[PDB]
Amino acid sequence: QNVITLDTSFEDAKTQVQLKKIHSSVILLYCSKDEAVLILSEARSLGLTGYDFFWIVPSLVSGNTELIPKEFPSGLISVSYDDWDYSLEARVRDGLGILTTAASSMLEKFSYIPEAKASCYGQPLHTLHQFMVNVTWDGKDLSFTEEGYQVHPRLVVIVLNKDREWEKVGKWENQTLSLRHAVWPRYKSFSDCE
Amino acid sequence: QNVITLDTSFEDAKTQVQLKKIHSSVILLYCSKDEAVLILSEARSLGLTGYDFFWIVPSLVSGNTELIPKEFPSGLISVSYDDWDYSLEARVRDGLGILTTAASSMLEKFSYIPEAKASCYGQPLHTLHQFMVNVTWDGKDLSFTEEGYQVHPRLVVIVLNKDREWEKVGKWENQTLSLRHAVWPRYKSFSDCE
Amino acid sequence: KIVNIGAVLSTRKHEQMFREAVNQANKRHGSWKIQLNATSVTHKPNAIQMALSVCEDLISSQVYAILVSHPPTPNDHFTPTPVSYTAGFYRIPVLGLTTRMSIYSDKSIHLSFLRTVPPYSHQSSVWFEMMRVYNWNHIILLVSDDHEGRAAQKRLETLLEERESKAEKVLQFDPGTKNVTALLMEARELEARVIILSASEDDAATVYRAAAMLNMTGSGYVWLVGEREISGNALRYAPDGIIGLQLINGKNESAHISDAVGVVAQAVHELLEKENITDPPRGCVGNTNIWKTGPLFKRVLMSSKYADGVTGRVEFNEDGDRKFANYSIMNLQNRKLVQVGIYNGTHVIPNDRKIIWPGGETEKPRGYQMSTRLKIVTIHQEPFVYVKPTMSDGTCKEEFTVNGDPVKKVICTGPNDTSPGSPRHTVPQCCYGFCIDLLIKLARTMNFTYEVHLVADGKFGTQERVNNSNKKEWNGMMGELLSGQADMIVAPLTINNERAQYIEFSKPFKYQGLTILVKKERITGINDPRLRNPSDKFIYATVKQSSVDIYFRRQVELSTMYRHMEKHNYESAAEAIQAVRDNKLHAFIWDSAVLEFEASQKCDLVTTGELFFRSGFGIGMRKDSPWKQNVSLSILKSHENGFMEDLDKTWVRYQE
Ligand SMILES: *[C@@H]1O[C@H](CO)[C@@H](O[C@@H]2O[C@H](CO)[C@@H](O)[C@H](O)[C@H]2NC(C)=O)[C@H](O)[C@H]1NC(C)=O
Ligand SMILES: *[C@@H]1O[C@H](CO)[C@@H](O[C@@H]2O[C@H](CO)[C@@H](O)[C@H](O)[C@H]2NC(C)=O)[C@H](O)[C@H]1NC(C)=O
Ligand SMILES: *[C@@H]1O[C@H](CO)[C@@H](O[C@@H]2O[C@H](CO)[C@@H](O)[C@H](O)[C@H]2NC(C)=O)[C@H](O)[C@H]1NC(C)=O
Ligand SMILES: *[C@@H]1O[C@H](CO)[C@@H](O[C@@H]2O[C@H](CO)[C@@H](O)[C@H](O)[C@H]2NC(C)=O)[C@H](O)[C@H]1NC(C)=O
Ligand SMILES: *[C@@H]1O[C@H](CO)[C@@H](O)[C@H](O)[C@H]1NC(C)=O
Ligand SMILES: *[C@@H]1O[C@H](CO)[C@@H](O)[C@H](O)[C@H]1NC(C)=O
Ligand SMILES: *[C@@H]1O[C@H](CO)[C@@H](O)[C@H](O)[C@H]1NC(C)=O
Ligand SMILES: *[C@@H]1O[C@H](CO)[C@@H](O)[C@H](O)[C@H]1NC(C)=O
Ligand SMILES: *[C@@H]1O[C@H](CO)[C@@H](O)[C@H](O)[C@H]1NC(C)=O
Ligand SMILES: *[C@@H]1O[C@H](CO)[C@@H](O)[C@H](O)[C@H]1NC(C)=O
Ligand SMILES: *[C@@H]1O[C@H](CO)[C@@H](O)[C@H](O)[C@H]1NC(C)=O
Ligand SMILES: *[C@@H]1O[C@H](CO)[C@@H](O)[C@H](O)[C@H]1NC(C)=O
Ligand SMILES: *[C@@H]1O[C@H](CO)[C@@H](O)[C@H](O)[C@H]1NC(C)=O
Ligand SMILES: *[C@@H]1O[C@H](CO)[C@@H](O)[C@H](O)[C@H]1NC(C)=O
Ligand SMILES: *[C@@H]1O[C@H](CO)[C@@H](O)[C@H](O)[C@H]1NC(C)=O
Incomplete structure (x- = not known):
């Protein structure tokens, strides 16, 4: 069924007509955080949080894993990468590895690599931007795209359990998606009255 | 669809959940005139007043023809026995016809039928309570029921147009409907927001 | 600051009790300037002057709530009515205290009446x-x-x-x-x-x-x-x-x-x-x-x-x-x-x-106290339920089969078809055959007696609309089932959707479909396109108010035949057999084994090759009842052995 768009900050007057067009099972939602809270509260009021009614949201909806807000159905599928396994110390260690790898592999090409800006007050060719398209440290493929993305990052597929927590379900390879549950787990109590 | 009732003066919190489940076209609404303005205002605020939808009400809200609030949807279908073709004089003529028919027909069985009470201070076999069934005066089948109603009563089917007035549309046979307009148009302009 | 409260009361002691309750209501309820005043009225034998006294007292009193506590000494009927109507004119609340009639629960009459007692x-x-x-x-x-x-x-x-x-x-x-x-x-x-x-x-x-x-x-x-x-x-x-x-x-x-x-x-x-x-x-x-x-x-x-x-x-x-x-x-x-x-x-x-x-x-x-006796209704089906008048005095002639097995006959009750057309006697009669022997086996299985009777008119039963208010009703064997006149339909009853919504079905004891009886020039079943638009040379119909009528009413592409065969429906199957024997018809729509039995009787009667609506004859039953499980289990026990094959050897397989 065609893509449902919203006009403005909804009065629950005209966007409700667009939401009543939905008779399918799985709904994809792409909006900001408070907009997701309002739309999921509306779908709770519309009864669109059922056992057959699945919701798959990106990391832009979730934001962070240490804060899980209210009005999320217990069984909300999210795709993010904020993992405790890829911890923040490992994050900054990989960042230092990428920076030192770029500086070292550019040092073999050009000598005067430290060329910094003087100051913020009082008003470049050998740059590291055009160099680290294919960079690799500790065997981890941390190469950078033209639009500033990791080529093979660690995509983590999580769900909301029966105790208001985000359980890690799936990890993602370079091509395949390594899943944990072949049979889809129900998560029957998405809310209370179900 | 489901039969939706209310509990109290609506909080627009949980009765709204009962109203959001409605997605079919035709809605039959049974509530008083003091309640119908608030209920139709809540329906208009939730987008339940499209020209795909239809609202048919009984004579409980359609009272005074002059008193029409702005919250009535242009396209409301009501039914009332108030006929502008039969005024009060024709109705009292029909009532006198019923009374004289019962008096002249009951006289053929027993003579001294009228026996009035003497006075209202300090307190019968043949009555017209069980004789009113077989009455026919001037061709009008004005027969009565066991519950006290009419067997073939005069009904009027009215609509609410865009001119914010009531138009006499549907008249009545012995048992079935006679529509002036077999074409049912949109009656689309509830307001300019469609 | 005052509040007037009226009271319709019987005695003089309870007037003092009402005044004492007014005095106690002004005890702990604060030092506010409001007061409570008491007003009491008594009985009158007639209710018109009761309403007159109440309105003359309480229009001049401006009361807010009225207490009505009539005890019925002469008559137990409607004594708190007039005060309730009088104050409900002005929508003033009336608290009934002694009455308990459920006509006061409907507020379409009494607009402003409440009561602190529960009704019946x-x-x-x-x-x-x-x-x-x-x-x-x-x-x-x-x-x-x-x-x-x-x-x-x-x-x-x-x-x-x-x-x-x-x-x-x-x-x-x-x-x-x-x-x-x-x-x-x-x-x-x-x-x-x-x-x-x-x-x-x-x-x-x-x-x-x-x-x-x-x-x-x-x-x-x-x-x-x-x-x-x-x-x-x-x-x-x-x-x-x-x-x-x-x-x-x-x-x-x-x-x-x-x-x-x-x-x-x-x-x-x-x-x-x-x-x-x-x-x-x-x-x-x-x-x-x-x-x-x-x-x-x-x-x-x-x-x-x-x-x-x-x-x-x-x-x-x-x-x-x-x-x-x-x-x-x-x-x-x-x-x-x-x-x-x-x-x-x-x-x-x-x-x-x-x-x-x-x-x-x-x-x-x-x-x-569950009944060992069950009311049984059935229709006269010629390969299934033979119905034959008695020989001497309410008794059946003991006839034998080809093996010397005595035909297990039962004394049923058979009325004639036209009750005003002839002097109708409703005499008992003999019933035997296929379904009768199946019922005798069922009564042999579980200890229960039975009383076989027949239907008043020769129809199976259809969802037919009555004339006043266009209401749906049932007739036939189903009309005698739902009216309590029957308890268990053991008969050639066709299982479909509209019947199972209202009654229950056992597992089917016979599996067959619909087919065409002709006189022999091929027809080749329902898929002959020339019968889709019939004429005066294609004269065929079905039994009036049968299952065939409902099955052809549901399928919309069979509507045209349904708009033809509705002009020629017959009251029973044997009348259609006798009509098509004299070439007054051209085909007939009926079940499989009945027409195969009629072909075994008469060689000119020919069944067609095609077959559709492969369904089953089962036992028509009531609602939730203790005859649901063991009846189906007894039928299935008759299916697992060769007893159904022996019943086929009696009449179904039996050629002549
Ligand atoms: C039931 O009838 C009895 C008859 O005695 C009443 O109860 C007593 O009523 C007197 C007068 O109001 C009170 O002083 C007493 O406190 C009541 N009885 C007791 C508890 O000793 C009354 O009319 C009726 N209701 C009750 C309270 O049982
Ligand atoms: C409070 O109630 C008393 C008793 O009902 C009222 O006194 C009566 O006033 C009427 C006025 O027409 C007299 O005819 C009666 O004689 C009085 N009572 C008796 C003795 O039956 C009194 O007027 C009320 N006061 C107010 C206005 O609160
Ligand atoms: C009438 O009232 C009592 C309470 O005074 C009810 O007792 C409760 O009943 C439920 C169901 O049996 C129990 O789960 C509660 O534990 C009970 N509570 C108490 C405080 O007793 C009682 O059920 C009611 N009906 C009667 C007379 O059985
Ligand atoms: C249906 O048949 C079964 C056959 O097992 C009957 O079940 C037995 O009947 C007794 C009667 O008291 C029951 O207590 C038991 O459930 C069964 N036997 C035992 C001891 O297991 C059943 O009664 C029949 N139902 C009817 C009357 O239709
Ligand atoms: C990495 O990218 C550079 C261009 O920036 C390219 O010249 C080089 O061949 C690549 N590395 C490999 C796979 O040799
Ligand atoms: C993709 O996956 C593996 C890691 O699982 C990686 O080493 C390699 O680059 C790729 N190999 C294949 C199968 O293409
Ligand atoms: C209550 O009384 C005031 C003053 O007479 C009036 O303005 C107001 O309309 C009333 N209450 C309502 C209906 O808001
Ligand atoms: C009513 O009276 C008339 C007298 O001709 C006649 O139609 C019939 O006897 C009665 N019909 C009914 C409905 O009782
Ligand atoms: C009611 O039926 C009669 C025929 O029985 C007919 O003459 C009459 O016109 C009908 N009345 C109406 C209102 O059509
Ligand atoms: C019924 O009786 C019990 C026991 O005296 C009491 O607890 C309860 O409040 C009574 N309920 C009413 C409403 O009379
Ligand atoms: C009541 O019961 C007896 C049982 O012997 C039987 O005669 C009949 O059913 C009834 N007789 C009367 C009316 O006493
Ligand atoms: C039923 O049928 C026969 C023949 O139609 C008829 O004469 C009679 O009324 C009934 N039975 C008897 C007594 O023959
Ligand atoms: C018949 O009924 C009697 C009395 O209830 C019972 O003893 C017996 O088991 C039943 N079954 C048979 C053998 O027909
Ligand atoms: C209703 O009309 C039918 C004809 O359609 C007729 O057979 C029947 O007797 C009428 N009344 C009853 C008793 O249903
Ligand atoms: C009226 O009274 C008798 C008394 O036994 C009762 O059986 C019957 O139902 C009524 N009418 C008759 C005599 O059939």
């Missing part, structure tokens, strides 16, 4: 609570009073809607008549023995006499009545062991008036907290407008919650009735009213006394 209809709730104690599910409802008893019947059907288990039979009649014995026979013939009655005194005494004439005080009978049946002359002729209901402090007048005055007092002290307060003026001087905060003050009175009370916790429901009322459950221990139970609104507790039943010992009546 909520007794049905207790009667629903009588079902969960002893696990009863089938009841027999006998409603005498047509004034308020329909409301109690509606409340009982509303409360049994949650279980989705209807009553077995409800009965309504007119109060005043005495000869109601046929209603008692209809209550007798059913398997349940739970009898629920709501009546006045005199009709209850009448049905008590007529039940004492008909052994209805014995073992197994359960009598369950209300307050109006355990008093008056009905108490003098009441059957022993009866279970009745009684209001705890239902005629204690003083504490009842005091609790009502406390309710009115807290309603007034809540009403003064709000603004936009008006007064109902002197209505006799040109005042046709109602009091403007009428529904507001009524909404205050409806949602008025209380935890104080001498009688107990008083609370109004969504219809203005007393919630959670304590009831006494009384038993009649040999013409002695004995309290055996108490009723809080959610649960029943019996006391240390034992509930002596109307029969023998103290064991509970398992009120399902």
Whole structure:
């Protein structure tokens, strides 16, 4: 069924007509955080949080894993990468590895690599931007795209359990998606009255 | 669809959940005139007043023809026995016809039928309570029921147009409907927001 | 600052009690400048001057709430009506105190009436609570009073809607008549023995006499009545062991008036907290407008919650009735009213006394005296149910088969087809054949007797609309099934969708489909396109009001044939066989094995090659009943062995 768009900050007057067009099972939602809270509260009021009614949201909806807000159905599928396994110390260690790898592999090409800006007050060719398209440290493929993305990052597929927590379900390879549950787990109590 | 009732003066919190489940076209609404303005205002605020939808009400809200609030949807279908073709004089003529028919027909069985009470201070076999069934005066089948109603009563089917007035549309046979307009148009302009 | 409160009251002592309750209502309710005034009126023998005195007193008084507490000494009918109508004209609230008629529950008449007593209809709730104690599910409802008893019947059907288990039979009649014995026979013939009655005194005494004439005080009978049946002359002729209901402090007048005055007092002290307060003026001087905060003050009175009370916790429901009322459950221990139970609104507790039943010992009546006799209806089907007139005197000629096996014949009852066309005798007759021997095997399996009768008119039964109000009804064998005249249809009944919605089906004992009988030039079944648009050379039809009619009414592409064969439908199958034998037809639509049997009888009769609607003949059954499991298991036991093959060797496989 065609893509449902919203006009403005909804009065629950005209966007409700667009939401009543939905008779399918799985709904994809792409909006900001408070907009997701309002739309999921509306779908709770519309009864669109059922056992057959699945919701798959990106990391832009979730934001962070240490804060899980209210009005999320217990069984909300999210795709993010904020993992405790890829911890923040490992994050900054990989960042230092990428920076030192770029500086070292550019040092073999050009000598005067430290060329910094003087100051913020009082008003470049050998740059590291055009160099680290294919960079690799500790065997981890941390190469950078033209639009500033990791080529093979660690995509983590999580769900909301029966105790208001985000359980890690799936990890993602370079091509395949390594899943944990072949049979889809129900998560029957998405809310209370179900 | 489901039969939706209310509990109290609506909080627009949980009765709204009962109203959001409605997605079919035709809605039959049974509530008083003091309640119908608030209920139709809540329906208009939730987008339940499209020209795909239809609202048919009984004579409980359609009272005074002059008193029409702005919250009535242009396209409301009501039914009332108030006929502008039969005024009060024709109705009292029909009532006198019923009374004289019962008096002249009951006289053929027993003579001294009228026996009035003497006075209202300090307190019968043949009555017209069980004789009113077989009455026919001037061709009008004005027969009565066991519950006290009419067997073939005069009904009027009215609509609410865009001119914010009531138009006499549907008249009545012995048992079935006679529509002036077999074409049912949109009656689309509830307001300019469609 | 004053508040006037009117009161319609009987005595002179309770006038002093009302004034004392007004004085006690002004005791602890604050030092505010409001006061409470008392006004009391007495009886008049006629109600017109009662309403006249009430309006002349209370128009000049400007009261807010009126208490009406008429005790019925001469007549038990409608004495608190006129004050209620008079104050409901101006939408002034009336608190009824002694009346309990369910006509006051409908607020379409009484616009501004409430009462702190529960009516008799909520007794049905207790009667629903009588079902969960002893696990009863089938009841027999006998409603005498047509004034308020329909409301109690509606409340009982509303409360049994949650279980989705209807009553077995409800009965309504007119109060005043005495000869109601046929209603008692209809209550007798059913398997349940739970009898629920709501009546006045005199009709209850009448049905008590007529039940004492008909052994209805014995073992197994359960009598369950209300307050109006355990008093008056009905108490003098009441059957022993009866279970009745009684209001705890239902005629204690003083504490009842005091609790009502406390309710009115807290309603007034809540009403003064709000603004936009008006007064109902002197209505006799040109005042046709109602009091403007009428529904507001009524909404205050409806949602008025209380935890104080001498009688107990008083609370109004969504219809203005007393919630959670304590009831006494009384038993009649040999013409002695004995309290055996108490009723809080959610649960029943019996006391240390034992509930002596109307029969023998103290064991509970398992009120399902299930019948070993089953009413059997069937139609005359020529390969299945042979129906043949008796030889000498109500008896069958003992005929033998080809193996010397005697044909197991039964004495059924066969009426003729046209009852005004001929002198109709309704003589007994002989029934045998396929389905009759199947029924004899079923009665051989489980210990139950049977009474085979036949249908009044030769139709299976169709969903046919009646003329007045366009209402749907049923006829035929299904019409005699749903009317209680039948219990188990053992007949060639075709299983489809519209029948299984209303009745239940066993597993099918015969598997066959629809086919075409012709005279032999090929036809090749339903897929001949020349029969799709028939003419005067294609004269074919089916049996009037058969399953073929419904099956061709559902399928829309078969509508044209359905618009043709509706002009030539026949009353029975053998008439169609005799018509097509003389070439007055060209084809016929009927089931498979019947037409194969007719082809085995007559060589010119030819069945076609195609076959459609592969369905099954099973046994037509009732609703939820103990004849669902073992009947299907006995049919399946007849399928697993060669007994169905032996029945085929009797008539189905048998050629001539
Ligand atoms: C308070 O109630 C008393 C008793 O009902 C009222 O006194 C009556 O006033 C009427 C006025 O016509 C007299 O005819 C009666 O004689 C009085 N009572 C008796 C003795 O029956 C009194 O007027 C009320 N006061 C107010 C206005 O609050
Ligand atoms: C039931 O009837 C009895 C008859 O005695 C009454 O109860 C007594 O009423 C008097 C007068 O109001 C009170 O002083 C007593 O407190 C009551 N009895 C007790 C508890 O001793 C009353 O009319 C009715 N209701 C009650 C309270 O049972
Ligand atoms: C009437 O009221 C009492 C409470 O005073 C009810 O007792 C409760 O009943 C439920 C269900 O049986 C229990 O789960 C609660 O524990 C009970 N509470 C108390 C405080 O007793 C009682 O059920 C009601 N009906 C009767 C008379 O049985
Ligand atoms: C249906 O047939 C079964 C055959 O097993 C009957 O079940 C037995 O009948 C007794 C009767 O008291 C029951 O207590 C048991 O459930 C069964 N036997 C035992 C001891 O297991 C069943 O009664 C039949 N139902 C009817 C009457 O149609
Ligand atoms: C990495 O990218 C550079 C261009 O920036 C390219 O010249 C080089 O061949 C690549 N590395 C490999 C796979 O040799
Ligand atoms: C993709 O996956 C593996 C890691 O699982 C990686 O080493 C390699 O680059 C890729 N190999 C394949 C199968 O293409
Ligand atoms: C009513 O009276 C008239 C008298 O001709 C006649 O139609 C018939 O006897 C009666 N019909 C009914 C409905 O009783
Ligand atoms: C009612 O039926 C009669 C025929 O029985 C017919 O003459 C009459 O016109 C009908 N009345 C109406 C309102 O059509
Ligand atoms: C009227 O009274 C008798 C009394 O036995 C009752 O059986 C019957 O139902 C009524 N009518 C008759 C005599 O059939
Ligand atoms: C009541 O029961 C007896 C049982 O012997 C039987 O004669 C008949 O069914 C009834 N007789 C009466 C009316 O006493
Ligand atoms: C209450 O009274 C005030 C003053 O007369 C009035 O303005 C107001 O309309 C009333 N309350 C309502 C309906 O808001
Ligand atoms: C019923 O009786 C019990 C026991 O005296 C009491 O606790 C309860 O409040 C009573 N309920 C009412 C409303 O009379
Ligand atoms: C039923 O049928 C026959 C023949 O139609 C008819 O004469 C009679 O009324 C009934 N039975 C008897 C007694 O023959
Ligand atoms: C027949 O009924 C009797 C009495 O209930 C019972 O003893 C017996 O088991 C039943 N079955 C047979 C053998 O027909
Ligand atoms: C209803 O009309 C039908 C004809 O369509 C007729 O057979 C029947 O007798 C009428 N009344 C009843 C008793 O249903």
